[PDB]
Design a protein around this ligand. Sequence first.
Ligand SMILES: Nc1nccc2ccccc12
Length: 377
Amino acid sequence: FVEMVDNLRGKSGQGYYVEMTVGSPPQTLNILVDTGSSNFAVGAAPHPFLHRYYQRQLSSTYRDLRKGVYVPYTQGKWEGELGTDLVSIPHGPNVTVRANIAAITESDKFFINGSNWEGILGLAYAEIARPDDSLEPFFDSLVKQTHVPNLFSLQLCGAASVGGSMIIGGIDHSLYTGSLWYTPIRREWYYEVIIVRVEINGQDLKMDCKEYNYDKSIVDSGTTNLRLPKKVFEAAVKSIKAASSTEKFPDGFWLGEQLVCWQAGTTPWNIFPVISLYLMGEVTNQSFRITILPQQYLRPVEDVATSQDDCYKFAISQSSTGTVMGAVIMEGFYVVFDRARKRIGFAVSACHVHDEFRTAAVEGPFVTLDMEDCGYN
Ligand SMILES: Nc1nccc2ccccc12
């Protein structure tokens, strides 16, 4: 699996991408790694933001499915033409598979100007595929057509350019320290999980745990932030704001409507608390917790023409679609998407940014009663 180590790159805020090839002869494209969706879709026309795009006319192995897809998100969108073709991952397993590919022919607020990726690899399940669950996701095709075991793991690092590893078919123990702890995939649509308890600084939010998961909690490599549901984010920041009363900041800041700047080499690490999510464990009444530091929820914004300090975006925010464990969480951990056993493993990442003080942790077991009641139906 050392072949796969360091096969991810990116820039802060613009996600993590892997090199893939499509068609015969092979066309090289950089493809965003997304556990939050389930379509394999690639730029297929000369949109000016794109370094390159899929040229179906050049591929002897292309096949038209003669059907379109339309994919609207919150304020962005793409649209494309469905087909199949031969797909490899140069720094991945030594196999080639025939996968569905959406040739993106129109889009809005999807591709990023200045970015170095040209498509998206949806690694979640068929249930949330588009147009419907009959379009076989890529990882499904990979597992059917080859002997690649039904799992992948992600070590997301990064600082500027970011980096990481996507180990397809397995686990690389150099990527983590201590033990893996597993939480069940509650249902195979998103990578859905259940948070059973939340502590800020060790003190807990004493919230009905059902709220922590209103209406979903998912693990998503295509989202930067830890996103928390209205009511939970509400209480969430209430406690973080109180934990950090030493210094003052605007409301808009906590709303991600403003940035906050401290002078260089002089940010208050310690005036923010370590935050801990308890996840449902593998055994009745047993949980574990994963703990992140503010270096995860306080993310720099590279630079500005209108300033030159250490200016950070508060990486926690609200949602009407649920908790989203994005890069803020995943960069603290080696994350194992154990599809064969319907579970997600968390271990302390060998590349997480730590001090000589506080440190990301994955600890258990804890005793948590009524953890099913925490799931929203
Ligand atoms: N994961 C993911 N994939 C595509 C679009 C998104 C928009 C907002 C959050 C996550 C997304």
